[PDB]
Amino acid sequence: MTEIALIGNPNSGKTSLFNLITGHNQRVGNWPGVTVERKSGLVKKNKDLEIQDLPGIYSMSPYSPEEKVARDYLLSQRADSILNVVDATNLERNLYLTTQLIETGIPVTIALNMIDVLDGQGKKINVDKLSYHLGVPVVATSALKQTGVDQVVKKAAHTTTSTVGDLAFPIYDDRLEAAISQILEVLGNSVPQRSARFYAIKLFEQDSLVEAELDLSQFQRKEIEDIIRITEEIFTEDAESIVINERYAFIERVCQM
Ligand SMILES: Nc1nc2c(ncn2[C@@H]2O[C@H](COP(=O)(O)OP(=O)(O)O)[C@@H](O)[C@H]2O)c(=O)[nH]1
Ligand code: ALF
Ligand SMILES: [K+]
Ligand SMILES: [Mg+2]
Numbered sequence: 515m516t517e518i519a520l521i522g523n524p525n526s527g528k529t530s531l532f533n534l535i536t537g538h539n540q541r542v543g544n545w546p547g548v549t550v551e552r553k554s555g556l557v558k559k560n561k562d563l564e565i566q567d568l569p570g571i572y573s574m575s576p577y578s579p580e581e582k583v584a585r586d587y588l589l590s591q592r593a594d595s596i597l598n599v600v601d602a603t604n605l606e607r608n609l610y611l612t613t614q615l616i617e618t619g620i621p622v623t624i625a626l627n628m629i630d631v632l633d634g635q636g637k638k639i640n641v642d643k644l645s646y647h648l649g650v651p652v653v654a655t656s657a658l659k660q661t662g663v664d665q666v667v668k669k670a671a672h673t674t675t676s677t678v679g680d681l682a683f684p685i686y687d688d689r690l691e692a693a694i695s696q697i698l699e700v701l702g703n704s705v706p707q708r709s710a711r712f713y714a715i716k717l718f719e720q721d722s723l724v725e726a727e728l729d730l731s732q733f734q735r736k737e738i739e740d741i742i743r744i745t746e747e748i749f750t751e752d753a754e755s756i757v758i759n760e761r762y763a764f765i766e767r768v769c770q771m
Contacts, residue, residue, distance in 0.1 A: 515561050518670050521584060521615060522599030523608050524570025527627045530657035531599060532567040534652055535667055546570055550580050552587060559664060562742040563671055566593070574614040574712070575721050588618055591706060594674040596622045597666065602632040602639065602654070609765045612648070613684050617715060619708030621678045622650045623670040630656040643771045649682030675708070683711055686760040692719060700737045704728060718742060719757050 520527040520528040524546035533540055536555030549569045558565040568584040574581045587593065596615050600608045615622050626641065636690050645652035651673055685691065697714040705713045705728065716724040717738055730738070742753050749756050 515675055516594050516671055517566065517567045518557075518563060518595045518597050518667075519584075519587060519593040519598055519605045519620075520568055521571065521588065521596050521611070522625075522627075523601060523604075523611060524573055526570065526601045526608065527657045528570065528597045528599045529567055531625060531627065531655070531663060532565065534657060534660060534663050535565055538702055540567060547580065550583075552583060552603060557671075560667070560671065563667070565667075567598070571611060573611055573718070574618075575716070575723065581718065588615070588620060589674045589709065591620070591708065593620050593678065595670045596620050597625055598622050598650075599627050600736045602626050602628050603635065605639070606762070606765050606769060608767070609648075610761055613764060614712065616650065616681070616683055616710035617709075619706075619710070619712070620675060621673040621681065623666065623673045624648070624650055624652045625662075625666045626652055626654045627657060629654040629661065630659050637714075640771065644768065647771050649684070649769045684761075684764045686764060687749075687756075689748050690745065690756060690760055691716075693741050696741050697738055700734050700741070701730075704730060704734070718745070719754055 518530055522528055529540050529542045529549050532538065532555065533542065535557050536597040537558045538555050540553055549567060551565040555565055557565055566586055566587065569580040571581045571584040574585055576585050598612055598615055600612065629678060641652050641654050651669045653662045653669060655666050694714050697717055698710055701710060713724060713728065746753055
């Protein structure tokens with residue numbers, strides 16, 4: 515059983531796609547926060563695949579307990595594949611979560627949803643260019659028009675932890691990359707090897723939840739803290755700002771193409 519997880523911002527159309535894929539009639543509403551818990555189902559056209567509908571999430575640093583459900587599912591390493599549902603009308607903001615999903619080490623396939631609205635707004639995105647610069651497969655989809663749904667399930671099924679070798683993580687400012695490497699060595703075996711980069715960046719971000727979940731040694735805590743301090747002076751900017759800016763700068767470079 516291949517495990518595919520529907521991850522994306524709230525109101526991106528995850529349940530709409532789920533319902534089409536599974537034949538289900540799970541709750542779909544035109545406001546953020548309808549889906550509040552996990553729901554599994556089998557892919558109608560390919561019964562070997564199990565797909566998970568999860569609540570909308572703005573980032574892997576959750577604000578509400580509903581956002582925690584999606585995060586915990588991915589970090590528990592249950593999912594073989596991340597089907598990242600992206601709102602094409604709000605691309606830049608949706609990609610902020612995308613950068614974090616890749617970092618989890620679970621291969622990401624993008625469903626570039628609501629392509630119909632984008633067509634009605636008189637705009638077009640070079641799908642192949644976006645896919646190449648992002649390092650992940652991209653299929654333009656519409657849940658309304660029922661466009662590209664089967665194709666994106668197909669690709670997600672072929673982009674799992676079992677079929678993908680080395681992954682293409684988003685590369686940031688080289689000065690931050692040095693800090694990430696050092697934290698990766700400090701971390702050693704305190705985290706899964708697959709998700710190591712995700713945790714390393716979140717520890718640099720001083721994410722309270724990650725810090726508590728990992729329960730790192732006093733020696734590890736001192737060295738990370740030292741790595742952050744030095745990198746802050748190099749960047750002449752606070753740790754949270756460095757990462758936030760570096761994600762959006764990466765997003766900027768990808769979108770212009
Ligand atoms: N126009 C258009 N609307 C969509 C599309 N996908 C979903 N929707 C609509 O987007 C809203 C959000 O749907 P939903 O599945 O609840 O989003 P979710 O919170 O990610 O599960 C609903 O009003 C759907 O009718 C799409 O591809 N095109
Ligand atoms: F905002 Al939702 F499922 F209702 F992501
Ligand atoms: K919704
Ligand atoms: Mg939903």
